[PDB]
């Protein structure tokens, strides 16, 4: 978990939402791309283990 | 059988080969009978005796027509695709049927017909010696192996290599790319730290050079671009020394014949030029001498590293252009690169590492013996990675390994832009790096406001932009807005982003909770 020495914005007055969360955007298929991994390393074998 | 395999890692190159295994989960490269860990990929026959490695390399002067070299890339190729340039000083590859063959005298009798051997047969005989050296050192019979291959190995070449190894009684568990093995050699060390890096692997070899740009997220590698070059390499470096000392020879001995025109003299020049070249990687001065070079004349001279780097500058700038080409080919900038791993025998040159340091910013880590204290021998990276991969899969069934490599497992969506949170002061903080294969999860800890209280977690998209040069982030479309109530003064706010295979984004911002989902 990366520690970053930067401050978060103070919440403006009069802002609220259901459970303090507001969904604005989402990811699209245009925002991604199908790439191929190298079948190498323990972390890939763990991924291949989960997929099977 | 899976439970009773004796596995090793093999690197099988045009110039050299190497073998490695793992002791206590650490890769170690094996030396063969000659004490070599970089074993020349050369086969030679004298009086019916088979020689390989350095002993075979020594016969390139006296016994060229019965020596086979530079045949790795010839495997699984049609004859029309063969480049015989580097074979000219040994057994020529010729066309026989639909196979590439070499004609050599491998029988003992002096009046015996020379044998005609396919390149696959040459590879098999060579792999027997490599495995044989590994088995002798291990005290056990090696049965299986992981072998590295270039990224432009055709499927026909992959089959030929597997078939050649099978004829050598060697089971190939998996073929992995040469760059990914180099990355694994570092990442699979105990002291290594997994983290998102854009990695450039510069594989500087003898007859070829390959530069590969990879995105490394979550301990998994994705190749973004790759370039190949057959003009700038270690052989080209041998040539600048051959030309340098031959002109000194012709000046010292007026009227004598040019040693480059005599094949026997030129062979002696190659062996000594490569030896002088390697010495210039360990010392600032190296000697160059050949007893009876031509016309019975001896020659002895010297050269310092400074003079070598000057006459070899054209080849060195070829290595620079290769690396800049690959980074540009991936749509990246040198400011986008985090690590530059230098691989291959030519990557031992101190000046090449210093040149790459000038190409990339100081934040980029140059993994070379002369530019980083934690670097590994550039000639051992591929063999170490193959041994590390072999030890991981040595208990797998053959069916499990094959399925683990099918497109359904290797292919998955990579997020193009970054996913992060907006920081304001009275700046974009990246959480999910660009080109991250999903599923993936990252977490950051940010500072709260001066006193805090209600604080806004604004999750947005991000893109890198170069300003004239400096890399900055540009905030794009906004994804979500969450709130944390009553944050302490000076406390840190933890923000987590999770992307699923479905491309669904789950957001969590609990300080040490609020949760939200973007379908
Ligand atoms: N210490 C050193 N300093 C400089 N160059 C070296 C050193 N050691 C080896 N080389 C060079 O590296 C080249 C071989 O590198 P490597 O063994 O990675 O090639 P390969 O992959 O086996 O062959 P190819 O690149 O033809 O497939 C040779 O040209 C050799 O002269
Ligand atoms: Mg190589």
Author numbering:
A (entry chain B): 3 to 54
B (entry chain A): 9 to 434, 439 to 480, 523 to 566, 571 to 577
Q: How is this structure described in the published paper?
A:
Ribosome-associated chaperones play a fundamental role in de novo protein folding in all kingdoms of life. RAC is the J-domain partner of the ribosome-associated Hsp70 homolog Ssb (encoded by two nearly identical isoforms SSB1 and SSB2). Our results indicate that both RAC subunits contact nascent chains and form a relay that transfers them from Ssz1 to Ssb. Structural analysis reveals that the Zuo1 N-terminus contains a conserved motif (LP-motif) which binds to the Ssz1-SBDβ in the same way as canonical Hsp70s bind their substrates.
We now determined the structure of an N-terminally extended RAC core comprising CtSsz1 with the complete CtZuo1N (residues 1–60 of CtZuo1) at 2.5 Å resolution. The structure has been solved by molecular replacement using the previous RAC core as a search model. The domain arrangement is as before, with the Ssz1 linker detached from the Ssz1-NBD creating a loophole for Zuo1N and with the conserved Zuo1 EPVG motif contacting the Ssz1-NBD at the linker binding site. In contrast to the previous structure (Ssz1-Zuo1N19–60) in which Ssz1 β8 was disordered and its position taken by Zuo1N β117, Ssz1 β8 is now structured and aligns with β7 of the lower sheet. Second, the N-terminal extension of Zuo1N contributes two additional β strands (β0, β1) to Ssz1-SBDβ resulting in a β-sandwich with two mixed, 5-stranded β sheets. Zuo1N β0 complements the lower and β1 now the upper sheet of Ssz1-SBDβ, aligning with Ssz1-SBD β3 and β5b, respectively. Notably, Zuo1N Phe23 inserts into a hydrophobic pocket between the upper and lower β-sheet of the Ssz1-SBD. A third insight gained from the Ssz1-Zuo1N structure was that a conserved region (SLPLPTL, termed LP-motif) present in CtZuo1N between β0 and β1 binds to the RAC–SBD in a substrate-like manner. Notably, the Ssz1-bound LP-motif adopts an almost ideal poly-L-proline type II (PPII) helix, which resembles the binding mode of proline-rich antimicrobial peptides, while the DnaK-bound NR-peptide adopts a more extended conformation.
